[PDB]
Design an enzyme around this catalytic site. Structure first.
Site, PDB file in Angstrom:
ATOM      1  N   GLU A   1     -63.003  10.995 -31.374  1.00  0.00           N
ATOM      2  CA  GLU A   1     -62.564   9.603 -31.095  1.00  0.00           C
ATOM      3  C   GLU A   1     -61.319   9.145 -31.875  1.00  0.00           C
ATOM      4  O   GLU A   1     -60.750   8.117 -31.541  1.00  0.00           O
ATOM      5  CB  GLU A   1     -63.700   8.609 -31.346  1.00  0.00           C
ATOM      6  CG  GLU A   1     -64.920   8.837 -30.494  1.00  0.00           C
ATOM      7  CD  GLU A   1     -66.085   7.959 -30.860  1.00  0.00           C
ATOM      8  OE1 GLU A   1     -66.487   7.965 -32.028  1.00  0.00           O
ATOM      9  OE2 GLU A   1     -66.666   7.244 -29.999  1.00  0.00           O
TER      10      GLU A   1
ATOM     11  N   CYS B   1     -40.417  16.275 -38.422  1.00  0.00           N
ATOM     12  CA  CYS B   1     -41.569  17.034 -37.964  1.00  0.00           C
ATOM     13  C   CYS B   1     -41.271  18.525 -37.916  1.00  0.00           C
ATOM     14  O   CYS B   1     -40.901  19.045 -36.852  1.00  0.00           O
ATOM     15  CB  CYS B   1     -42.002  16.547 -36.566  1.00  0.00           C
ATOM     16  SG  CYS B   1     -43.621  17.105 -36.017  1.00  0.00           S
TER      17      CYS B   1
ATOM     18  N   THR C   1     -62.396   7.336 -20.783  1.00  0.00           N
ATOM     19  CA  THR C   1     -63.571   6.917 -21.535  1.00  0.00           C
ATOM     20  C   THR C   1     -64.762   7.821 -21.308  1.00  0.00           C
ATOM     21  O   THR C   1     -64.944   8.281 -20.248  1.00  0.00           O
ATOM     22  CB  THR C   1     -63.915   5.417 -21.295  1.00  0.00           C
ATOM     23  OG1 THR C   1     -64.949   5.008 -22.162  1.00  0.00           O
ATOM     24  CG2 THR C   1     -64.426   5.167 -19.940  1.00  0.00           C
ATOM     25  N   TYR C   2     -65.562   8.001 -22.335  1.00  0.00           N
ATOM     26  CA  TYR C   2     -66.869   8.661 -22.224  1.00  0.00           C
ATOM     27  C   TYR C   2     -67.943   7.633 -22.352  1.00  0.00           C
ATOM     28  O   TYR C   2     -69.077   7.984 -22.371  1.00  0.00           O
ATOM     29  CB  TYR C   2     -67.030   9.753 -23.284  1.00  0.00           C
ATOM     30  CG  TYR C   2     -65.856  10.687 -23.265  1.00  0.00           C
ATOM     31  CD1 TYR C   2     -65.593  11.497 -22.198  1.00  0.00           C
ATOM     32  CD2 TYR C   2     -64.942  10.672 -24.300  1.00  0.00           C
ATOM     33  CE1 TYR C   2     -64.467  12.323 -22.175  1.00  0.00           C
ATOM     34  CE2 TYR C   2     -63.842  11.506 -24.315  1.00  0.00           C
ATOM     35  CZ  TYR C   2     -63.590  12.338 -23.229  1.00  0.00           C
ATOM     36  OH  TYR C   2     -62.471  13.134 -23.176  1.00  0.00           O
ATOM     37  N   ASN C   3     -67.566   6.357 -22.353  1.00  0.00           N
ATOM     38  CA  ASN C   3     -68.505   5.270 -22.424  1.00  0.00           C
ATOM     39  C   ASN C   3     -69.349   5.311 -23.681  1.00  0.00           C
ATOM     40  O   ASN C   3     -70.509   4.940 -23.663  1.00  0.00           O
ATOM     41  CB  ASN C   3     -69.394   5.344 -21.198  1.00  0.00           C
ATOM     42  CG  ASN C   3     -68.737   4.856 -19.963  1.00  0.00           C
ATOM     43  OD1 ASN C   3     -68.575   5.559 -19.034  1.00  0.00           O
ATOM     44  ND2 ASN C   3     -68.344   3.643 -19.965  1.00  0.00           N
ATOM     45  N   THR C   4     -68.806   5.834 -24.756  1.00  0.00           N
ATOM     46  CA  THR C   4     -69.556   5.960 -25.964  1.00  0.00           C
ATOM     47  C   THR C   4     -68.818   5.372 -27.136  1.00  0.00           C
ATOM     48  O   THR C   4     -67.655   5.297 -27.121  1.00  0.00           O
ATOM     49  CB  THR C   4     -69.965   7.423 -26.272  1.00  0.00           C
ATOM     50  OG1 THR C   4     -68.967   8.094 -27.015  1.00  0.00           O
ATOM     51  CG2 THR C   4     -70.314   8.165 -25.007  1.00  0.00           C
TER      52      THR C   4
ATOM     53  N   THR D   1     -66.167   0.250 -23.082  1.00  0.00           N
ATOM     54  CA  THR D   1     -65.245  -0.006 -24.194  1.00  0.00           C
ATOM     55  C   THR D   1     -63.855  -0.267 -23.681  1.00  0.00           C
ATOM     56  O   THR D   1     -62.880  -0.128 -24.417  1.00  0.00           O
ATOM     57  CB  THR D   1     -65.198   1.204 -25.111  1.00  0.00           C
ATOM     58  OG1 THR D   1     -64.610   2.295 -24.374  1.00  0.00           O
ATOM     59  CG2 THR D   1     -66.602   1.617 -25.515  1.00  0.00           C
TER      60      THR D   1
END
Length: 368
Positions: free
Chosen positions: A341, A60, A264-267, A276
């Site tokens: 995401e 790296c 989470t953004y619940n999407t 999710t």
């Protein structure tokens, strides 16, 4: 995001991408600032040289270049950058446990720990060894985040995630959701469903910072051993051990694992109502299954049921062979999912990886 910081040119290039998710950045920055900027058991130049060694394992040149410049800035002896055969005896003993933490952490036995302590000359404390293990694992997991998201060096934060179009005002996926539905409503083929998932499967200048290059996740002589997670969990066993030996970074590793697991953004890529927790648990559990860790009553059939063929090959590349991640591979999975995401999966992934690596090394310390 934290958009005023990101677009400003005053901050690290890797930090910018991570700004997409502010709840993880909060916790990530605390550990970064603890390890590389706060009074601790090891001198400030030794911490930047442990980070070069760790990041060199995956070739790296982003992270080796950062810590090379910071090593020199913080008053490090420049001879040490000619190669590893030029560093103190204390720091070379560390490159046997380093290649294992990176690539095959299950192989860390108590003998590896014994080697690092009890000798006559410049031996490691537990205070110091623990801090070095957190630095090595931090730089291995930043190293997988760097290639996964494509983070380009300073002299376009990434060639895979385009930030400037991403910043601003503007099918089969439904299938995945439906499937997620059926799971939520709900014995000897549990162990043998884990067994099938588990076995399923350049650059001259930084070779000198490693002992044995081409040591790799893969055997090249022919599946890790199965390990029950309950024998040595983070919550019960491993959090207590880091707490007693290194008080400051025990708490900040717990809050950061819990921040990236909880996040989470619940999407789901342009759908807002889902929980999710089920999908993220699968990503977290599959990466632990690559590093040999079975959870005692988790249905491992759920994994390839919810995770695409191309998400699996991407997750396994970034976790095990992080270089030779290509943009073709990044685009070829979750094609209708948002760029933020994908970064989210990189978060879950690096943190799962680190925990696995840390748990095997802490397992070796309590057995001593």
């Amino acid at each position: 995001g934290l958009e005023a910081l990101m677009s400003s040119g005053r901050v690290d290039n890797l930090a910018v991408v991570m700004g997409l998710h502010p709840d993880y950045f909060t916790s990530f920055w605390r550990l970064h600032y603890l390890l590389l900027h706060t009074d601790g058991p090891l001198a400030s130049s030794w911490r930047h040289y442990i980070a070069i060694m760790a990041a060199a394992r995956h070739q790296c040149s982003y992270l080796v270049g950062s810590h090379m410049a910071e090593f020199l800035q913080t008053g490090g002896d420049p001879e040490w950058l000619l190669g590893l055969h030029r560093a103190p005896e204390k720091l070379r003993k560390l490159s046997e446990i380093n290649k294992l933490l990176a690539h095959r952490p299950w192989l860390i036995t108590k003998e590896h720990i014994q080697a690092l302590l009890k000798t006559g000359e410049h031996t490691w404390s537990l205070a110091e060894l623990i801090q070095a293990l957190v630095l090595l694992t931090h730089c291995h997991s930043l190293s997988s985040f760097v290639f996964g998201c494509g983070i380009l060096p300073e002299g376009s934060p990434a060639p895979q995630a385009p930030t400037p179009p991403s910043e601003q005002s503007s099918r089969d996926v439904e299938a995945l959701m439906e499937r997620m539905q059926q799971l939520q409503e709900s014995q000897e083929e549990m162990e043998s469903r884990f067994e099938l998932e588990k076995s399923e499967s350049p650059h001259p200048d930084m070779l000198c910072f490693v002992e044995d290059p081409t040591f790799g996740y893969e055997d090249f002589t022919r599946a890790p051993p199965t390990f029950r997670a309950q024998d040595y969990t983070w919550e019960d066993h491993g959090y207590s051990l880091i707490q007693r030996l290194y008080p400051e970074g025990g708490q900040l590793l717990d809050e950061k694992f819990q921040a990236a697991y909880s996040l989470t953004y619940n999407t789901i890529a342009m759908h807002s109502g889902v929980d999710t927790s089920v999908l993220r648990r699968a990503i977290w559990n599959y990466i632990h299954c690559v590093f040999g860790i079975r959870y005692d009553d988790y249905d491992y059939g759920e994994v390839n049921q919810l995770l695409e063929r191309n998400l699996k090959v991407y997750i396994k590349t970034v976790a095990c062979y992080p270089e030779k991640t290509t943009r073709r591979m990044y685009n070829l999975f979750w094609r209708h999912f948002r760029h933020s995401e994908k970064v989210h999966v990189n978060l879950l992934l690096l943190e799962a990886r680190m925990q696995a690596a840390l748990l095997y090394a802490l397992r070796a310390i309590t057995r001593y």
